[PDB]
């Protein structure tokens, strides 16, 4: 039973390499985004095997071939080990997130907010220090030890019954919202160094987000991606 769907997707794999917050974030403003918007880009990992761009669900997947200087590059994530074995249309499972540090002896901390909710983006002045509002909340902010790994299992929280691996409808009205599901995510995480904003350093520390799909259930048999002949 190594082809078992509950067995095959029940293993950890990479999703995204996101940057660690060192201040009160500004969540990326929805599309389209005009220039000059001061925000914080690529710090958020939208936990979905579907393609993303700027920590929001995307229609297509797009990487960069010649990343020149003009414009802000966008953190586009995809689950490569999923779609090559996702011969189905719908997929409900409970996510298991593991956040491995890519910085030597980093003390980080992993926030989360559910499918449909939003990041709390401000700061309160505790003891003349700008402590942001992502240290607190009713959602899991797991804290890592100095050089440790954050791991927890997230439930199927979204208001959709299943996650469409392939979707053909329109979430909002039409004209370029075709094939773009809105509520297909287990939520979003983000890493933050648990120090106030006056202790913001200068280096840009990354972190890596793993994913395990506990209790995978797949419906509606469909295709596998096209392999070229070159």
């Amino acid at each position: 039973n190594h082809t078992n769907v509950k067995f095959l997707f029940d293993r950890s794999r990479l999703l995204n390499v996101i940057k660690v917050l060192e201040k009160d974030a500004v969540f990326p403003r929805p599309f389209p985004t005009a220039t000059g918007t001061q925000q914080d880009d690529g710090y958020f990992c939208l936990l979905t095997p579907r393609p993303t761009v700027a920590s929001r669900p995307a229609t297509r997947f797009g990487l960069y071939v010649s990343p020149s200087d003009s414009g802000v590059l966008a953190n586009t994530s995809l689950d490569f080990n999923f779609y090559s074995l996702a011969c189905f249309t719908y997929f409900r499972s409970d996510l298991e997130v593991t956040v491995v540090s890519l910085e030597p002896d980093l003390e980080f901390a992993v926030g989360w907010f559910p499918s449909g909710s939003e990041y709390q983006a401000s700061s309160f002045v505790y003891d003349q220090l700008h402590v942001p509002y992502h240290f607190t909340g009713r959602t899991p902010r797991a804290f890592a030890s100095k050089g440790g790994k954050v791991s927890f299992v997230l439930p199927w929280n979204s208001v959709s019954s299943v996650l469409p691996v392939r979707w053909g409808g329109a979430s909002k009205l039409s004209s370029a919202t075709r094939g773009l599901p809105a509520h297909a995510d287990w939520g979003t995480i983000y890493a933050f160094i648990p120090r106030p904003n006056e202790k913001k350093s200068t280096a840009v520390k990354h972190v890596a987000v793993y994913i395990r799909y506990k209790n995978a259930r797949a419906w509606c048999p469909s295709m596998l991606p096209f392999r070229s002949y070159k």
Binding site: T3, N4, A218
Partner: peptide, 12 residues
């Protein structure tokens, strides 16, 4: 609940 969806792939 997901009782309404037909054709659950138990096994690939």
């Amino acid at each position: 609940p997901v009782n309404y969806l037909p054709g659950e792939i138990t096994d690939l």
